[PDB]
Curated annotation (Swiss-Prot), chain A:
This is Origin recognition complex subunit 5. It is found in: Nucleus. It comes from the Eukaryota. Coiled coil: none annotated. Component of the origin recognition complex (ORC) composed of at least ORC1, ORC2, ORC3, ORC4, ORC5 and ORC6. Interacts with ORC6. Component of a cullin-RING ligase (CRL)-like complex composed of at least the cullin RTT101, a linker protein MMS1, and the potential substrate receptor ORC5. Interacts with RTT101 and MMS1. Belongs to the ORC5 family. Component of the origin recognition complex (ORC) that binds origins of replication. It has a role in both chromosomal replication and mating type transcriptional silencing. Binds to the ARS consensus sequence (ACS) of origins of replication. This subunit is a candidate for the mediation of ATP-dependent binding of ORC to origins. May also be a substrate targeting component of a cullin-RING-based E3 ubiquitin-protein ligase complex RTT101(MMS1-ORC5). It comes from Saccharomyces cerevisiae (strain ATCC 204508 / S288c). The chain holds residues 321 to 476 of 479 of the full protein. Disulfide bonds: none annotated.
Swiss-Prot record, chain B:
The chain holds residues 271 to 430 of 435 of the full protein. It is found in: Nucleus. This is Origin recognition complex subunit 6. It comes from the Eukaryota. Component of the origin recognition complex (ORC) that binds origins of replication. It has a role in both chromosomal replication and mating type transcriptional silencing. Binds to the ARS consensus sequence (ACS) of origins of replication. Coiled coil: none annotated.
Curated annotation (Swiss-Prot), chain C:
Its main location: nucleus. Belongs to the ORC3 family. GO terms for biological process: DNA replication initiation; pre-replicative complex assembly involved in nuclear cell cycle DNA replication; silent mating-type cassette heterochromatin formation. The lineage of its organism: Eukaryota, Fungi, Dikarya, Ascomycota, Saccharomycotina. Keywords: Acetylation, DNA replication, DNA-binding, Nucleus. One of its GO terms (cellular component) is nuclear origin of replication recognition complex. One of its GO terms (molecular function) is chromatin binding. Transmembrane segments: none annotated. The gene is ORC3. Component of the origin recognition complex (ORC) that binds origins of replication. It has a role in both chromosomal replication and mating type transcriptional silencing. Binds to the ARS consensus sequence (ACS) of origins of replication. Component of the origin recognition complex (ORC) composed of at least ORC1, ORC2, ORC3, ORC4, ORC5 and ORC6. Interacts with ORC6. This is Origin recognition complex subunit 3. It is found in: Nucleus.
From Swiss-Prot, chain D:
The chain holds residues 258 to 618 of 620 of the full protein. Belongs to the ORC2 family. One of its GO terms (cellular component) is nucleus. It is found in: Nucleus. Its main location: nucleus. GO terms for biological process: DNA replication initiation; pre-replicative complex assembly involved in nuclear cell cycle DNA replication; silent mating-type cassette heterochromatin formation; subtelomeric heterochromatin formation. It comes from Saccharomyces cerevisiae (strain ATCC 204508 / S288c). Component of the origin recognition complex (ORC) composed of at least ORC1, ORC2, ORC3, ORC4, ORC5 and ORC6. Interacts with MCM10 and TAH11. GO terms for molecular function: chromatin binding; DNA replication origin binding. This is Origin recognition complex subunit 2. Keywords: DNA replication, Nucleus, Phosphoprotein. Present with 1700 molecules/cell in log phase SD medium. Component of the origin recognition complex (ORC) that binds origins of replication. It has a role in both chromosomal replication and mating type transcriptional silencing. Binds to the ARS consensus sequence (ACS) of origins of replication. The gene is ORC2. It comes from the Eukaryota.
Length: 122, 157, 544, 325, 85
DNA sequence: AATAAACAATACATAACAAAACATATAAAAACCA
DNA sequence: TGGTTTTTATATGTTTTGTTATGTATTGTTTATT
């Protein structure tokens, strides 16, 4: 059962969503208006906070501690850069990706009482 | 529940009826017609937008009384909750929070704040600045306390 | 003038002293607690590094320090007739199998000559260390940040150390400073080497937050440093509950930061801070007497006074009609000790050893005390059920405490410590009126340069065309003001030839547009996708 | 896909741009700008008091802060602290982060010389940078608490300072009590740079400063297509007089028909056309002074044997009436 | 169709380790041996991405194809029905 | 249930391209012996 | 300090792979008749 905090826990649970998901489908199915086996896809920045703001219990707006736990998660090597480990800060072309298998995601979903198996649909 | 009975036009005679009771001056009373005419084209529901704009300007044109009397803030919304025959005060505040960001990218409100000189200004330039000398509202302020004082001690003697 | 050259150096209170006697005195309690865990971490490694005599004696001893912050320093015993050296290998110094060997042999070798009073930097020195330096060798490996290294390099590294096990005058010891996730580590390595690792492993936990043995301790030593001279309000402490829960690794350095900054706020604005010692009663003034009046518990008790005593001639006299009795009405309630501090210290040591309970947070224990939820606090062990009546305290509604208190009733240290970063930027660019108050008449009829496109920048698509955005940008600029602006100056000549040109307005727009979108790249708001084409860009910044 | 493009824009030369840009940035919103500058001036005693606590002060906000930091660090703070400790005042070491040529070795070589060389620290110089600063830290834990240095780091998200081996270097500097760290960033993703490890070493606090400055110095290193159609605009101004004529005959029939491939001309007839006006002797004498148009990438060729100019339809008639005529 | 110990997840890795160093599998894009020294030295400094994805997702490919297994595995073994599809 | 015929709606093969993996090169930084 | 080697940043090239648009071919849908 992983050490990380609650907002960082939901930070992990949004990062696993773009495993088998692509930008062609996500904005339709997560509107405000199976690759469980396969290798994970590539992120960009702010697609996290696109999904993070949606799935959090207007109740949150300050994102200073949310930006804190990203590079906390970068030191844990649970989400790593596609390129070399140097310039990833300033938004040049940098793609991100998870490195955690499905089971540790599945326990950490129920550890914060959040349901994830609904949104994975072959 | 007149606010949820949507898709009705508030004509030029109809909208000036909706603002002469809330005591709007001629500067904004034409502007409400001006920006409804902006938003008569791209609307979704005409009842929600027409009331959301009239509250925040009365929040900013009557703030020389609103910051000096907290009781009239319920008075202005409940007299519209009786006028629009709303359900409760839950849905009406949901409107005024909504359209406020929807009018924050326009021109005239950035004028209407700085034309009316209304706001208070030196608080916000010290709140957003992160001043250690900003007002902490664990207190009641000296004016409102003196408003409390002169009301009570003359009620006393 | 010189700003394009990088890093050029150049060589160009009655209230605050009462802070100074309080601040450092608190900080003597801080750092003395800091060396306690510093002596704790240095102790528990040291005994466990020794006295472990295994029977096979052909295996290194490994130590996994779970939960450790990758900065844990270690001291070693002297242990004469044998040198004991420390090598540290940072993932920055882990490029390959090769230089991980070569720098590490270099790092001990200079450490070997300095104690000794040409050679080759590989394992050749390791066997001849008996002859090269006399006494034997016991090296230790402070792997600082172990999960960032490519583990096959680490797995190939430890097989290289396995070959050194046949010389019998050298002893190896490995220190694995993981950040977390021991189960992750047994996944990454080769399984043939885990069986090499599993001879004598020790899973010692080192965490700053371990059952709150120091978290509840440092808040406790905070309370006695401010004992009786202040209070801690309910909305303040829940901020300390919520925000400190968002940082798992180092609460203890954070609780020093947000508390001491909170104390810095009190001394900098509150005038009654001088009166926390009763010797300062001679500094009393009518200006101090005027500002005491607007306290909420002051005026509420007067409302309590009139309804209790419907005769108000006494109450009117003790108002500003008198001033000597008026301050005497204040200093009646001046010395209020507020035993919620002492009642906390009463119950803190109790359940620590009477019921002997350790999984508890003293701050919410102080917070549940502030509402009266201490009964619904002890329930989570059902062990104070024989003691809920003797550890009972109803929090009394104390009087005049709003002058000696700390609370984020203004949202100050919410803002200045945890700032809503991209919220405050985006609020600065849509509104701009509450930040900024001949040519200023143009400013009252024209927005500033950065913000005027921002309203259309919201109203633009995901990927946008450059020129049509400028075409929309030219709509927001009215024509008569610019020619009034470009012809404002008769003194300059070089501008004035541009001022009389009939296409000056459409030229000065693209100049001004290429100073603003030029300035939206260092902020990272807009990214130039597919360079040397730059016909379309991408906007990442959304409102939320 | 009929898209309006930056090529289809009324362009502006070098001296025309920068002068009228200098007019706006010194006369647009001048009165409210110093009106802001007087408002924030009262915060200056508050910064002095907190900075005694060794707090790494960080300034965010829209607009450039470069002028504001240099007023606040140099003129206000650095003699005020020297007077309040009791002689030259406190040394200011700025770091221009917008200058990409900042390294970790050179600035730290300044630092240990800016700081005290009380011991032979060149003996520990052997990557020993983290090693040499660690021996600096533990000695500084047992010294009398007084600031001897204030450093400024402008544009902390800059192109070299945001590199990760440099960032951790500054992290160990900030835990020392003797030095005050007053820096500013401008990025919207600046708090992606720090975890709870570094901010533990940093203990950052934040303040907003938004004066909507134009960033004069910070615009210089940056470039867009203002800074080729404009490139070969200057080479033709210094060549032989015949190259002007053979480009004029080139530009006519290449604009007889955007300027794309299809409007171009075959090599044989163009040799005959430039033989018609007694200009091209043969293919070699044509091609050799056509390689000079090739070497400065002033014309293209694709396949008829089509040579075509890569500039737009609007650009070539601008090249017609101005420089060729 | 019939008593055979189905193994776990945490143990097949120990068998999976020998199978890749028995060269029955290969990594997907892995140039094995460089020709000379300075081409190999240029591959040593290069930090890799396949280690940065975990052990159970390194896309391993095949050295010995399925159809050839039927010719070598005798029919007496029970898995002979699985050589052919 | 089958056949036929007119018409509409969908799928398919490939063209054109984008982007990521895979690969090399060299000047500037940065260690690093010495 | 000082030369020398090693790594990194910047820059471009190569091959595989996956997405999308579109004109043409296929397939479904309805109605009359056997």
């Amino acid at each position: 059962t992983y050490d990380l905090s609650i907002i960082s826990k939901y930070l992990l649970i949004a990062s696993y969503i773009c495993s088998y998901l692509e930008p062609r489908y996500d904005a339709s199915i997560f509107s405000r208006k199976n690759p469980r086996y396969l290798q994970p896809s590539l992120f960009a920045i702010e697609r996290l906070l696109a999904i993070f703001q949606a799935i959090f219990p207007s109740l949150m707006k300050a994102n200073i501690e949310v930006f804190q736990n990203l590079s906390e998660l970068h030191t844990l090597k649970l989400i790593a850069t596609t390129m070399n480990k140097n310039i990833d800060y300033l938004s040049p072309k940098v793609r991100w990706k998870v490195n955690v298998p499905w089971e540790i995601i599945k326990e950490i979903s129920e550890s914060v009482h959040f349901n994830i198996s609904d949104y994975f649909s072959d | 529940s007149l606010l949820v009975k949507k898709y009705c036009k508030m004509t030029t005679e109809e909208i000036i009826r909706l603002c002469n009771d809330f005591e709007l001056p001629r500067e904004v009373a034409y502007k409400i017609v001006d920006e409804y005419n902006i938003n008569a084209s791209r609307l979704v529901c005409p009842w929600q937008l027409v009331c959301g704009l009239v509250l925040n300007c009365t929040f900013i044109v009557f703030n020389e009384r609103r910051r000096k009397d907290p009781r009239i803030d319920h008075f202005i919304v409940s007299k519209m909750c009786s006028l629009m025959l709303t359900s409760k005060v839950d849905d009406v505040i949901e409107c005024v929070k909504l359209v406020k960001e929807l009018i924050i990218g326009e021109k005239w409100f950035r004028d209407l704040q700085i034309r009316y000189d209304d706001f208070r200004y030196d608080e916000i330039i010290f709140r957003k600045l992160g001043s250690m000398l900003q007002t902490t509202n664990i207190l009641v302020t000296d004016d409102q306390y003196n408003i409390w004082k002169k009301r009570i001690e003359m009620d006393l003697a | 003038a010189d700003a394009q050259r990088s890093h050029y150096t150049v060589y160009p209170e009655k209230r605050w002293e009462l802070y100074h006697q309080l601040h450092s005195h608190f900080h003597d309690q801080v750092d003395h607690i800091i060396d306690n865990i510093e002596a704790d971490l240095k102790a528990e490694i040291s005994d466990l590094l020794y006295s472990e005599t295994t029977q096979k004696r052909r295996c290194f001893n490994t130590i996994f320090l779970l939960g450790s912050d990758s900065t844990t320093k270690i001291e070693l015993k002297d242990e004469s007739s044998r040198y004991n050296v420390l090598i540290e290998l940072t993932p920055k110094e882990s490029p390959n199998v090769r230089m991980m060997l070569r720098r590490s042999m270099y790092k001990l070798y200079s450490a070997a000559d300095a104690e000794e009073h040409d050679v080759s930097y590989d394992l050749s020195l390791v066997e001849n260390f008996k002859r090269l330096f006399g006494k034997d060798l016991a090296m230790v490996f402070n792997f600082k940040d172990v999960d960032s290294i490519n583990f096959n390099t680490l797995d190939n590294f430890i097989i290289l150390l396995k070959s050194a096990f046949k010389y019998d005058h050298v002893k190896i010891s490995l220190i694995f400073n993981i950040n977390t996730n021991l189960s992750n580590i047994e996944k990454n390595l080769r399984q043939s080497t885990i069986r090499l690792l599993k001879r004598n492993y020790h899973k010692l936990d080192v965490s700053s937050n371990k059952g709150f043995k120091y978290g509840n301790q440092i808040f406790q030593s905070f309370l006695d440093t401010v004992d009786g001279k202040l209070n801690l309000s309910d909305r303040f402490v829940e901020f300390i509950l919520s925000k400190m829960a968002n940082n798992t690794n180092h609460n203890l350095q954070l609780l020093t930061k947000m508390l001491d900054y909170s104390l810095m706020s009190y001394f900098f604005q509150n005038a009654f801070s001088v009166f926390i010692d009763p010797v300062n009663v001679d500094f009393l003034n009518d200006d101090y007497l005027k500002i005491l009046s607007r306290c909420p518990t002051f005026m509420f008790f007067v409302e309590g006074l009139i309804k209790q005593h419907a005769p108000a001639d006494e109450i009117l006299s003790l108002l500003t009609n008198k001033n000597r009795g008026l301050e005497e009405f204040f200093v009646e309630f001046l010395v209020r000790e507020n035993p919620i501090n002492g009642h906390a210290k009463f119950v803190a040591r109790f359940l620590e050893e009477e019921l002997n309970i350790t999984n508890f947070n003293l701050i919410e224990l102080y917070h549940n005390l502030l509402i009266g939820k201490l009964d619904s606090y002890l329930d989570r062990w059902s062990a104070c059920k024989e003691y809920k009546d003797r550890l009972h305290f109803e929090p009394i509604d104390t009087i005049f405490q709003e002058l000696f208190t700390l609370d984020n009733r203004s949202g100050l240290l919410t803002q200045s410590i945890f700032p809503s970063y991209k919220s405050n930027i985006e609020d600065n660019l849509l509104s701009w009126e509450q930040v900024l108050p001949l040519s200023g008449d143009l400013d009252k009829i024209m927005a500033p340069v950065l913000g005027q496109l921002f309203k259309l920048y919201r109203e633009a698509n995901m990927t946008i065309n450059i020129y049509d955005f400028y075409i929309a940008f030219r709509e927001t600029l009215p024509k008569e003001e610019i020619l009034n602006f470009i012809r404002k100056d008769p003194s300059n000549t070089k501008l004035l030839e541009l001022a009389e040109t009939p296409d000056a307005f459409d030229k000065v727009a693209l100049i001004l547009f290429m100073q603003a979108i030029f300035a939206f790249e260092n902020m990272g708001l807009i990214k130039f996708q597919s360079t040397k084409s730059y016909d379309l860009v991408e906007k990442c910044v959304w409102r939320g | 896909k009929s898209r309006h493009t930056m090529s289809m824009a009324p362009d502006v030369t070098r001296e025309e741009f920068s002068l009228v840009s200098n007019f706006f940035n010194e006369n647009f919103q001048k009165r409210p700008r110093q009106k802001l500058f007087e408002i924030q001036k009262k915060m200056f005693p508050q910064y002095w008091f907190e900075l005694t606590q060794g707090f790494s002060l960080l300034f965010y906000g829209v607009g450039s802060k470069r002028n504001f930091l240099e007023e606040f660090a140099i003129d206000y703070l650095s003699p005020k602290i020297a007077y309040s400790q009791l002689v030259n005042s406190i040394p200011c070491l700025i770091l221009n982060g917008y200058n990409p040529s900042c390294n970790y070795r050179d600035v730290f070589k300044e630092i240990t010389d800016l700081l005290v060389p009380a011991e032979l620290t060149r003996s520990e110089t052997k990557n020993h940078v983290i090693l040499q600063i660690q021996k600096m830290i533990d000695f500084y834990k047992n010294q009398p608490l007084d600031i001897k240095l204030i450093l400024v780091v402008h544009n902390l998200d800059g192109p070299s300072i945001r590199k990760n081996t440099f960032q951790t270097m500054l992290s160990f500097l900030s835990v020392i009590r003797q030095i005050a760290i007053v820096a500013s960033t401008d990025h919207i993703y600046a708090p992606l740079l720090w975890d709870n490890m570094k901010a533990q070493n940093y203990n950052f606090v934040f303040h907003d400063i938004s004066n909507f400055e134009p960033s004069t110095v910070e615009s210089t290193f940056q470039d867009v297509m203002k800074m080729g159609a404009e490139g070969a605009k200057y080479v033709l101004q210094s060549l032989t007089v015949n190259s002007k004529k053979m480009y004029k005959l080139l530009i006519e029939t290449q604009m007889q028909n955007r300027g794309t491939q299809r409007t171009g001309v075959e090599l044989k007839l163009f040799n005959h056309l430039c033989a018609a006006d007694f200009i091209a002797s043969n293919e070699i004498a044509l091609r050799s002074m056509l390689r000079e148009f090739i070497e400065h990438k002033m014309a293209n060729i694709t396949k008829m044997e089509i040579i075509w100019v890569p500039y737009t339809y609007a650009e070539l008639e601008k090249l017609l009436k101005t420089v060729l005529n | 169709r019939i008593t055979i110990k189905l193994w776990l997840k945490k143990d097949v890795k120990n068998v999976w380790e020998n199978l890749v160093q028995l060269d029955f599998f290969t990594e997907k894009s892995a140039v094995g041996l460089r020709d000379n020294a300075t081409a190999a030295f240029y591959a040593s400094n290069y930090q890799f991405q396949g280690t940065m994805i975990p052990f159970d997702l390194r896309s391993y490919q095949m050295q010995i194809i399925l159809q050839e297994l039927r010719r070598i595995i005798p029919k007496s073994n029970m898995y002979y029905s699985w050589t052919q599809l």
